[model samples]
Structure formats: C-alpha cells, structure tokens
Target: STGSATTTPIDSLDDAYITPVQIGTPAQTLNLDFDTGSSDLWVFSSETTASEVDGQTIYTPSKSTTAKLLSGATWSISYGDGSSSSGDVYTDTVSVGGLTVTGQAVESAKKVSSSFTEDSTIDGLLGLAFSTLNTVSPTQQKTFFDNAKASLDSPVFTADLGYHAPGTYNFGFIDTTAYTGSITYTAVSTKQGFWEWTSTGYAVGSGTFKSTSIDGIADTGTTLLYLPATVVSAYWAQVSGAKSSSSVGGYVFPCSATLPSFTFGVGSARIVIPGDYIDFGPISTGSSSCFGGIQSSAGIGINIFGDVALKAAFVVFNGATTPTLGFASK
Candidate 1:
C-alpha cells in the first residue's frame, strides 16, 4: 500500500494543486485538490443539482458497481475562505497514485457555493488532514491517508509543492532525491487536526531576524501567506506606497514596488521566500494596484503558511509517532 502521486498546478489564480483520484469499481477518475486544511473526500456528483454545477467534471456513482449509499448519512464542510459544499455519502473503493483502499467514504455534493461553481477547473476535494476532522455524520470517516497508513511501509507523506510548475505528493516513503541539503526537523502539535507549529522568528529581506515565536498552520488548501497584523504592517510599511485597504481586505501596493524577502525559522534552518513571491498579482489584470500575498491573519488566530510560502521549500508531513515536519531547499 505504498505509492506516490505527481500533482500539477493549474496556474489560474495560483490557487491550488490538483491530482487525479480513482473512485469506485471500474475506477471513475476525477481531479481533486489534496487539501491538508480539511478532512472530507467530497466531489461534484450526479446528485448535484444541475444549476449547482457549472463546467466542472462530475462523478457518477450509478456507473460504478462498487458504489453503495451509506443510508441516512450526510456530510457538509465550510472552508476558511467561505467556500462550502454539502451532500450524501457512499462507500466505495478509492485509489490515489497506486495505493487503494476499500469501503472508503466518498461524499457526493448536492450543493456547492459560488466560489466552487465558478472554479470550473476543480472537480472535488481530497482531504489529507486527521480523521478526527472528518465531517461525515452517523460516524466520522477516516482520511485516505489514515486508511492506508497501517499498510504503508512507513507512516509518512511528503509534499513537494512548486511555483508555476509541477510537484508531487509521496506516500509511505520520502524521496531524498526530490530535495537538497539536510532536512531540518521541527515538532508539530496536531491536537487541532492541523499540522500546527511555532516558528522561532522571521525577518524581512536580509534584515536581522527577530526571536519571536509565531504559531501557524502549514495549509495546502490556502493560497496566500497570512500572519499577524503587526507583522503584516511592519512588512508592508517597508514598501513605499503600501497601505491597508478596507475594500481589498488586506494590504495593497504599487505593482512596481520593490518587495523584500520573507524568511521563517525552523529549528536551525532558515527557509527564505523570495520577494517576488510576495507580490500576488494586480488588483485586476492591467491594473497598477497589486495585492500583497502576505497579509494579516485577523480572527483566524494562527498564521497560515499557504501555497505562497509552502511552494518555496520541500515539505515533509511525517505521520509517524510524535508527528513532525521536515523542510529543505527544493
């Protein structure tokens, strides 16, 4: 039950990474977002009302002989970004990369928010968080990783996320060849069903990094890097015209602003995110106003190292006893 899967980024919005997953007998394949921020294997399906689904691909359970409804059971989930979905459940064989698991709960969406409906590229979500975070009713369901962990040679997975390129999600084993230099290890606290850790400090550009511990979650499903208000303000203040705007919900600056590098400390290793990566994009295409990728994590409590930050390094999400994180230069 050991396998690895290569995922490619769909450049639009620099939003998420997608991988193909096989569901049911005879295998109906759908492109799914492997999200670590949530725990629910949900898809756009035949059960979805026609109006609820736009141009996205859908999973048809009736075509699969192994699909069986979990009578009276349902599941629903809402993301931090306000995107949500809800639907009924089915038990079927599910496979990722080359690893397969039987009787896996697959939630079929009957309703989806406009955010999902508009993103026609994404078909469904494959949650990789802890099983305890599953939203299924009657009984909580185990994640694909959780169901396959026992059979894996090593209970571990690696995320090699890239910017404007392809990356991989490896299971059961780590590919030393995928990363360079030594891997820096850090302890993780997963009580909240997230890979949450504290950074010793951070810095702007080549400036001296402070020794301030900042708690945050490494989220694959999130797009931008969200830190505290004070930190966000400090970083943006360095940019000449940067300012917080109520309309934009975060800081914005001139498209030509010279941005500074952002670095995070993990143990003795320092992972640096290039300044160019912090300039998300223009407020609108052809517009001089650009949005800052690193913003304040107001109300969310902890910072979120989303794709903007994670893509800069090769990350190892070790699921072994005493879960930990290993990071190295990609």
Candidate 2:
C-alpha cells in the first residue's frame, strides 16, 4: 500500500517539519517531528513530568486498548545540538497518512531536555532512518518505516521539503509529478545509523566545481546545512561583509549582501541551492545581520545535508537490501 502526508515547517527557518501522526486505539493525533537523523520514535506522554510538559500534546498509552508496556525496555537519545529525551517504552498501533503499522515501539517521554520543552510546536519525533540506530535497551525496536515496509508496495519513502510552502512525505511509492528531471542514486552507509552518502563535489555560486569527495548525511530533523571549514571559507569569502562571529556562534553577514548560490554534485546531476536559502535568517529580530544556513562542520564531526540542502531537491530513502538515497530536482 502507498500513503502520503503533509510536512509543514514549524518555524520561519524551516527548522523542523511537523507531520500529524495518529496513535492509540481511538486515534489521538499529534504533530510530530519526522526526523531522519535519529532512530527513535519517542513522544511526550502521560508519563512525562508535568512540570516539563508545555503546550505539546502528550500521548497517553493507557487510553489505547492495544497499548502494552515493554517492561524493562527503555530509551534515551541526545541530539547533536545537545537536546534530548528519554523514557519508558510501549508497543502500540501507529499510523501516518494512510499507512498503518501495528505494534510499533512508541517511547513515552519521562524526561525531556529544556530545549524540547521550550520548542512546543512538536509533540514528539518519528525516526525514519535505519533500525540499527534504535536506542531501546535490551531489545532494539524497528522504526515505523521498517515495520510498514513489509506491507508496502515498495520499501521506500520520499521527502519533498518546501521553503515556505507545505511539503509532502510519501511512503511506499514516489510521486512522479512532484519533481522534475531524473533522480541520481547514491549508496547509503547505515553503519553510522544515518542516511550517510558521499557527494562528488561542490561549487560556490557558478564557479568551477571542486572534484572532491564530501561525506554527509541527509538529516531532515536538522535546521541547516553544515560542510567542511574549507568549503565554508570558500563560499563566505565571496560575500562582502561575512564573518565568523563568536557572538552569533556561526557565520553572519549583512542581510543586504548578495549571497552566492550553493551547488552539490550527486552523480552527474548538480542540485543548486538558491542564494536566498543560504541566508538563514537574521541573528536578532529585524537585525541587519543575518546568520548563514551553510555553516562549517568543524566540531560537528560529521557533515550534515540538512533542511537547507534537502529543501532544494526531492529525496528518496530506499529501504532495499542495499539501502540507497536518490536526489532529484523539483
């Protein structure tokens, strides 16, 4: 079977994509962050500390007749940005769009970091990455995608992240009309439990393409695209008042500066990110200085092809025996 759902950006930066997910017996719907960067289907729940809970809709497993506690099974996850959530585990029926997955592991948040509590837009996170990255102790659990793949027409899902407009996330089949041109496929290394792949090269604006291999992961949960320091320097050097500021904690420049476009090679296809996309947003509200969406991944360890990059193209997370990623222009 095939199913599709709407993914709406929760903030002006297009930071997190929120998708309405149905959980429990009577089907309580909650807005969740559909993340490919982490492998944990966790949610704010009745078990979550009352003081920690804010405006997020909490999942109450007790209300679901099909819900069953997983006993000792537990989960905890800390993200690259230091935000984290942890709690008890339960098996319950979960559905997204029209796709249904019975007995999916749904972690109930007993504790949540300050950042997660502050970000009240999303109630939880639905991980779409490989199951190897599952954080459940004793027995790792399969993600919604993995459990549904067996029943799907095809074991795949596509991400069509938009800039200001709402995007679509399609499961079991690709929507041909959603994109233009052919897709470029690349091998995904799930060893790190991520949709990690290698790019042939990159270019600053319309400049010559650098023929070097860059390892990066396609992370829909993340807010910006992070690359190597050298690549960041090459791009920022072209912008007139761009500087790496400690106060801003990243590269910032005059909002009026003419930003250069960013392009990365996927096979022979070049996906170009418009200059406007790179100008993330102003450091302070209505400030003349803007923070860049493309930042250096120096301390980040692994490079990230986050929303800023993913929004520029259509992405396919193929769940074949040999998992691969496909990119196409839209």
Candidate 3:
C-alpha cells in the first residue's frame, strides 16, 4: 500500500514545510515538521507547561483509549538552532496520510523552548531519519517510515518540498509525474544516522565547477544550506553588495542584488540551485537587506543541504538496502 501527504510551506521559502499527523485513537491531529535531520516523533501535549503552550494544539493521551505510557522512558532533544523539547513517552497508533503504524512511540513534550512556543502553528516534529537517532531512553523508538516500511509496496518515500507553495510527500510509491528527467542516485553513508553524502564540488553562477569534495547531510528540517566557510565566502563574493553580518550572523546582501545560481555535483549530475533560491528573501520585514540562504558551517563540522537546497529538486529518501539518495529536477 502507498500513502501520500500534503506539505504546507510556512511564511517564507526558507522557513519550513509541515504536514498533518494524526496520533492516538480519537485522531488528535497536529501540524508537524517532517524532519529528516533527527529521529523523534515529539508533540506538544497536556503535559506541556501552559505558559509555553500558546496557540499550539496539544495531544491528550487520556482521551485516547489506545494510548499507554512506556514505563520509565523519557526523551529530550536540542537542535542546531538551539530549539529544544523534552518529555515522557507513550505508545499509540500514529498515522500520516492514510498510512498507520500501531504501537508507535510518541513523545509528549512537557517543556518547550521560546522558539517552539512562539512558532504558534507548529505543534511538534515527525522524524524521518534512521531509528538509531531516536531520542527515547531505555529503548529507542523507530520512525513512522521505519515501522511502515515492511508494509509498503516499495521501501521508499519521496520529498517534493516547494517554494512558497504546497508540495506532497509520497510513501511506498514514487510519483514519476512529480519530477522531470531521470533521478541521479548517490550512495549515502548512515554512519552518523543521517542521510549523509559526498558532493563532488560546487561553483557560483556560470563559473567552473571546482573538484573539491564536501561531505554533507540532506536535512529537510533545517532552513538554510550550510557549507564550509571558505566555500560560502567564495559564493557570496560573486554578489557585489554581499557581506557577513555579525548582527544577523550570516551573509546579508542588498535585496536588489542579482544573485548567482549555485551548483553542486552529485556523481555525474549537477543540481543547480537558482539565484532566487540562494537569496532567502528579506532579512526582516520592511528591510531592504536580504539574507543569503547559504551560510558557513563553521561550528557545525558537517555541511547541511537544508530546505534552501532541497526544495530545488525532487528527492527520494530510499530506505532500501544501504540507503541511497535519488535527485531529479522538478
């Protein structure tokens, strides 16, 4: 069987893409960020501090007849951007689209950081990475995809994230009509529990494609593309008005600057990220300065092909075998 869900893009292109997920017996639906960077299906629940809840929806375990607490199990997760959540665990039926997984480990958040609390619409996160990355203690949990893979007609899921528009995530089957050209496959190394791959190199605009290699992860949860400092500096240099902003903590340029397209090589195929996608839009509302979606991964040792880069193509997160990544122009 196959399942598909709609992915709605938040305010800007670089913000995030969220999908609705139903948890428990009565079907408590919540909008969750489908994250490929980490593994933990955590949600805001009745246990969350009222002061931090705001307008977000909360999951009520008591209302679900199928819900049961996983004794002594707890979970806590902190992201690269410093957003975090922590709570106890419950095993229940969780569904995304029409695909359902029984006895899925669902973490109920009791505490959330200001970032999560202020993001009014986001109720939680649905992890898509390997089960090994799950944060539950005593016993780690498997992701919805991991648990549902055996029941699927094909052990594959595709992400069609869009810019300022709604896209669809397809499970068990590939929607060939959603993309153009043949998919270029690359072997992924899950040594770190991420969809990590090596890129042959990149170049700014119509410049020559350098042969330097970069090891990075394809993360849908992250907003921007993070590369090495020198690589990022070289790309931004092509923009006349671009400069590093200590206040903004990234490269910022005039909103009217003509940005250059960036290209990354995967095997023999070159995926080009259009110039407009590189400009992540204005730094702030009513401001003429814009932030570059590509940034330096100085502190984080690994580069990240976040939404800024992922939305440019159709991506297949193949769960079969050693786990490979297939990309094609959309």
**Which candidate leads in TM-score?**
2
Error of 1 at 213 (Å): 0.7
Cα displacement (Å) at residue 49, model 2: 0.7
Q: Rate the local accuracy (lDDT) of all candidates.
A: 0.88, 0.93, 0.92
Candidate 3: which stretches are off by over 4 Å? Answer: none
Candidate 1 Cα RMSD after full superposition onto the native fold (Å): 1.2
lDDT leaderboard ranking: 2, 3, 1
Every candidate's CA RMSD = 1.2, 0.9, 1.1
Would you estimate the TM-scores of all the predictions?
A: 0.97, 0.98, 0.98
In Å, residue 263's CA in model 2 sits off its true spot by: 0.4
Candidate 3 structure lDDT: 0.92
| Top of the candidates by lDDT | 2
Tens digit of per-residue lDDT, candidate 2, span 284-322: 999999999899999999999999999999999999989
* Model 2 lDDT, full chain set: 0.93
Candidate 2: worst 10 consecutive residues by lDDT? Answer: 8-17
Candidate 2 at 13: error in angstroms? 1.9
> Clashing residue pairs, candidate 3?
none
Q: How many times do residue backbones clash in model 1?
A: 0
